[PDB]
Design a protein around this ligand. Sequence first.
Ligand SMILES: Nc1nc2c(ncn2[C@@H]2O[C@H](COP(=O)(O)OP(=O)(O)NP(=O)(O)O)[C@@H](O)[C@H]2O)c(=O)[nH]1
Ligand SMILES: [Mg+2]
Length: 163
Amino acid sequence: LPTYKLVVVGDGGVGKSALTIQFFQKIFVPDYDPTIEDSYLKHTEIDNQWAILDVLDTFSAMREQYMRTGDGFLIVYSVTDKASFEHVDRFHQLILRVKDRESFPMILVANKVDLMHLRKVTRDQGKEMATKYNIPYIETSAKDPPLNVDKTFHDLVRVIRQQ
Ligand SMILES: Nc1nc2c(ncn2[C@@H]2O[C@H](COP(=O)(O)OP(=O)(O)NP(=O)(O)O)[C@@H](O)[C@H]2O)c(=O)[nH]1
Ligand SMILES: [Mg+2]
């Protein structure tokens, strides 16, 4: 029974926590930022193959353990936060250095696309960035009813399996 350690990274406020709690617990709780580090563990079936998903919602010995051991990374920015998108490169570079690899399983996640009037990063900008890194691109909303939240996590597992 394979365990996949997934790591969610990105700037403050982009929705790492909201995405994770939506995926594991199927709720959206506005302006909830966890008091303590919460680990996430669940059995789920992806393309008929069962897996344990072990997720870190990112000093911390825990963080750096997951950065080192992680099987795949979600790199999240918010479409309403241009800086968060500009900072994606820091996260991409950080991950490749820690894994000492030229590529590693990862998905670029453009979150908060429900806030349409506030969108500062276009679909095509996002897609062009993902292309530059040769990684998948997906748009999400953690807000109910959620968009692409299961697909995002399941797709990362698919990337890991198909490497
Ligand atoms: N409308 C909308 N709000 C969202 C979405 N995702 C997160 N939010 C909201 O944005 C705020 C910040 O989200 P949060 O999940 O805590 O972000 P974070 O990346 O975990 N922040 P941190 O790095 O500081 O832990 C919260 O108020 C949350 O409800 C989304 O898809 N749509
Ligand atoms: Mg958080």
